[PDB]
Amino acid sequence: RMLIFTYKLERYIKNKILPKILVVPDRDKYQIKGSFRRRIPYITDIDIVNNVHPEYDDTNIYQRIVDLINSFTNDNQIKLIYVICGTDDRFLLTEYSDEEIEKIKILLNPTELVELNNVNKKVFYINEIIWDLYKLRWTSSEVLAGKKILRGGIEVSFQDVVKNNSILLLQYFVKIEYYPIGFDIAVRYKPFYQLKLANYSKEYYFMLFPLRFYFKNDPTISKQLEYIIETKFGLYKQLLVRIDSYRTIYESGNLDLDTAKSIIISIIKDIRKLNGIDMNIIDKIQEVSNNSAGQDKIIAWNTLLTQLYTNINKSVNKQSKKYFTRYINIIPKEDRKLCCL
Ligand SMILES: [Mg+2]
Ligand SMILES: [Mn+2]
Ligand SMILES: [Mn+2]
């Protein structure tokens, strides 16, 4: 039932999906990156680099994206949510006490902003707010229209953006089996922070990731860490990503009831395989599915998935603390300070 890696699935992806969503389908012109390249058992998403020059360049890449978009209009399995290309430099801060001020005029909610101006490495929640504003995320209709309106009413055109950039990102969601899966395609048409243990509070599961990088060239330890992260706790991570998929699709304004329901159904089934979960959250989700309807249901679910998200994090971090302490103690105290760069 669950979406697990198999070669039947990989072949289906490479044969039936990729030729449809890639700018250049030729196998020699694309590379699979990230977790899918490692063929992790609990598939989360697919990351791909598409090197399309000289086949495609500044002068014809737009029309090829238009072709892709149009080919999907009547395809219920594939949706191109965002085309990411360009930046809005007005949100290019210099992180100076005076920089910030000059941007508030174009923000709506700077309470959240001032509610975390408190206090040098917390630029993380600053960029966490303005990232979507700095990086231009084009919708399909904005791409087809060929123009985009920015905050404050500033006008921008897609052709200008491609001419001033070397790469664009296609953000797809694809219904592979029972629910949507993210496909991120980095399209190159012209010729990191989460690795520091210092930037973590006590998210012990995610703090294993810097450790895995540290021990990447140690066979015995890298196998153990890979097993722990990807198999023992693999489903915890997959469920977090799957909840992010709901959120992302919903926030973009493209989640219909049928898709929301398929996601919620898959989560209810799989959540029972986990340990330490407040199953009351699950019961609350079922009661929504019973006494709400249409959009109100989608919204109520979104709200409840947020609690569930928190709960899953809490649980996996708790069950992970010992594996962290174990492997961190393998590193010398002098070096364990600034793991791992
Ligand atoms: Mg579609
Ligand atoms: Mn990935
Ligand atoms: Mn991705």
UniProtKB/Swiss-Prot annotation:
Its main location: virion. Signal peptide: none annotated. GO terms for cellular component: virion component. It comes from the Viruses. The keyword Transmembrane does not apply. Pfam families: L544_helical, L544_NTransf. InterPro entries: L544-like_helical, L544-like_NTransf. It is found in: Virion. The keyword Lipid metabolism does not apply. Keywords: Virion. This is Uncharacterized protein L544.
